[PDB]
Amino acid sequence: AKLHDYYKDEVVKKLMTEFNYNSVMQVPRVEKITLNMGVGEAIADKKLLDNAAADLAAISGQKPLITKARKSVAGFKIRQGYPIGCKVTLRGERMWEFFERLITIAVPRIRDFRGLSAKSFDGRGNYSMGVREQIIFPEIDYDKVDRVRGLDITITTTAKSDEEGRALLAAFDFPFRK
Amino acid sequence: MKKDIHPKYEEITASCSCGNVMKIRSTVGHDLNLDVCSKCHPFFTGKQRDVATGGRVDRFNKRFNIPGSK
RNA sequence: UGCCUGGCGGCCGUAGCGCGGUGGUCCCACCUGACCCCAUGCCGAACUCAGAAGUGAAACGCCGUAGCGCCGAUGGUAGUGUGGGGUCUCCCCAUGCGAGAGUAGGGAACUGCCAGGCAU
RNA sequence: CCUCCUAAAGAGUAACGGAGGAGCACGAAGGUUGGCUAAUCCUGGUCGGACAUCAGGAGGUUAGUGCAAUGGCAUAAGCCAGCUUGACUGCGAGCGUGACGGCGCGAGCAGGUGCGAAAGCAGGUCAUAGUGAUCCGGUGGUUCUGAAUGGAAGGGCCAUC
RNA sequence: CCGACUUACCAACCCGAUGCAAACUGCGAAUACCGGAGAAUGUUAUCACGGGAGACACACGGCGGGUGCUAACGUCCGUC
RNA sequence: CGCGGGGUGGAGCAGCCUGGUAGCUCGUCGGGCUCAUAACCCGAAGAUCGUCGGUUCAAAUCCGGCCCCCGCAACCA
RNA sequence: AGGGCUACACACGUGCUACAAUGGCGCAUACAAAGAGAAGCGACCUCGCGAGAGCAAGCGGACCUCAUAAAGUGCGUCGUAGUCCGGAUUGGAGUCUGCAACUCGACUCCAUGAAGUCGGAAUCGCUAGUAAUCGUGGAUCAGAAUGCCACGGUGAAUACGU
């Protein structure tokens, strides 16, 4: 993926000196983007969960797979483990290529006020966000002309501060939230 | 990798330096340097002598007397 | 012969935790490649296989550290058998047994087999 | 009848004595092999709700356990998946238990089946509660047998209701 | 109203520290009990088989626990 | 410090046979309607299903404590 | 002098307007009555997207303007989609009278956007140039009606029975 190739070739060599590490093994990276698509209440309908799995079947070559209620406060018919979302855990080439569709073809999906939130980083290397609509990646420029549903995001990184979170992949043309 | 759709970049990254119906370089703000502020300060930022739509020039010599039509 | 590292054990835990210093192209871990054997809820994350480079960050490990877990006297004390005395709610004495907690002091484990690195 | 306490550190043990459970469930909630690991709180984001989820951190098992509760459980006795049906048949030294009928564990053998590379494991389910001895009534198998002889109602034996 | 300009007002989570428990433990006796070895003493103890029981309504007291009232010349049990 | 039944919106009553609020009817409220109101007619709202605690994804509904109402027990001699 | 008569989770009497298609929209296009105007009405012409303003013939109205009155007629287009309908609400800007348009006026332009799918118990006007339905003018009036008074256009259905 060109975003990761640029990040290792140009950005990692500068983060080395901006944070003045002793080892090249200290420089931050994204580990995984784990996802959820936590639409909820879908056990009473099933077709909503099948439609959310059909959006995730188009974000990556990877297969959709259910997320479930754990505290399960709402209730329907079955105890505890009723489904709420359809996940797809992306890593490496399958997450770096997706972030490269953002602001190149997904331009109507991403706004300045919906950019990267610089205050949402933490020194544990954990991050999360919502995008309120589905964003697909086909073999060509295409959109399924269907809406209603949306997606939420979960990310793990090797960053040991929230300031190194603000430096990781920060050279790309994706906006920042303000 | 139990692949269900195929990722390809050649149709979506070629000629992306410009803005068109198929792809755009960047979105609104950031790299596009868009401004989104609001302001007021009505009338007094301009010249205060402003006049309505009409057939005459500025500082004209006369005005037609409507009773003088007889 | 001594020092250091690795796999596998002994003990049955003053064998630990926290903190600080600090080390590795011996080993080790991070780590590179995935395509093949093998594999995933999807996922080369995990498991598996072919393994380059760089490093000592994490993980790993040694040393310093008595802050914490913790070892812990002597003596008294509680409890308790028997005998005598004896209060209604249980108790005193002679005599045999006698803690737990605390104080002082201590504690940063000890050790075996086999292989690797290093030294005259 | 089971568990904790009554119960007094070998052991047994009462009173309408204090608390809680049992009348069944499981063909997966069984065998076997490999691997995995929590309640809860904090952190982060929004269609995402409520206080609801994915991820990370702290917690370091509190959770989970077919069914209340104690004991026990990480080498898991908790949990997930492949193959599998030992939810074994004929037998059993020894130990534990009760007055006895009867009852719990079990060294170990032969047959036959299954897992695991193989060592190795498989007598159902973490163990204990889920009412039924004996006469008797029914039903399947049966050269074990059937009174003058041969068949036989019938009797016995085994299995089970 | 997200938020905040405010103390006048409550409590233990959490935390420092004191107090406490049949159905809490982190610690943990004495006295027993039972296997093994052993002296002296005990008229056979311990135990198998056989003939025969009587007994199944036990009680004030000491020491321990329940219950009642930390009542009973009470009541259930452990124990002499 | 016994036992059995009861505790529902303003008011009466159904329910539960272990659950997934709000039923039926009178009343109330606005509207049609009348000179006006009773009343017919149309439509809508209500509520800590005694209460606190327990079980559960979910409790008015199952279960324990407690408060309240009614009945039963409440001596033979 | 300023404020209020105009406030606001309500209800009603009476009126307006829409939900469209024998309707809307863009273009072409036909046939009226009536009424006001001396610090007033007003074409041609000029300026502006436009309200309107400038310039200015005419006139006191059988002499002029509103004015191609609109519905209707010709042509393209929409297919029931909350629309090519409705356009409340709401942002911005311009025009107007007047001492002055903040609460609280009228007109114009751009943009935005909601209920509404022909509506309960029920109810009202009308017998023909009537109702239904389309447009116009005036009083009152600095300015300012969807009410009131008057006007002309298109123009029904049905009337057994009592």
* Biggest alpha carbon–alpha carbon distance for chain A: 57
Could you tell me if A170 and A28 are in contact, meaning their C-beta atoms sit under 8 angstroms apart?
no
Q: Across the interface, do A115 and B11 touch by the CB < 8 Å criterion?
A: no
E-assigned strand segments in chain B: none
Query: What is the identity of the amino acid at B4?
Result: D
Q: Which nucleotides of strand F are protein-proximal, with an atom < 7 A from a CB? A: 20, 56-58
Q: Across the interface, do B16 and A104 touch by the CB < 8 Å criterion?
A: yes
What does each C-alpha distance from A41 to A33, A47, A124, B8 come to in angstroms? 24, 11, 31, 35
CA distance B3 to A118: 34
Segment holding A162, helix H or strand E: helix A162-165
Q: Nearest-CA neighbor of A52 among A65, A62, A61?
A: A65
CA distance B24 to A102: 10
Q: Nearest-CA neighbor of A39 among A60, A25, A53?
A: A53
Question: B37 labelled as ligand-binding?
Answer: no
Convert A111-146 to b/e letters by CB count within 10 Å (16 or more is b).
ebebbbeeeebeeebebeeeeeebbbbbeeeeeeee
Quick check: A72 CB within 7 A of strand F? yes
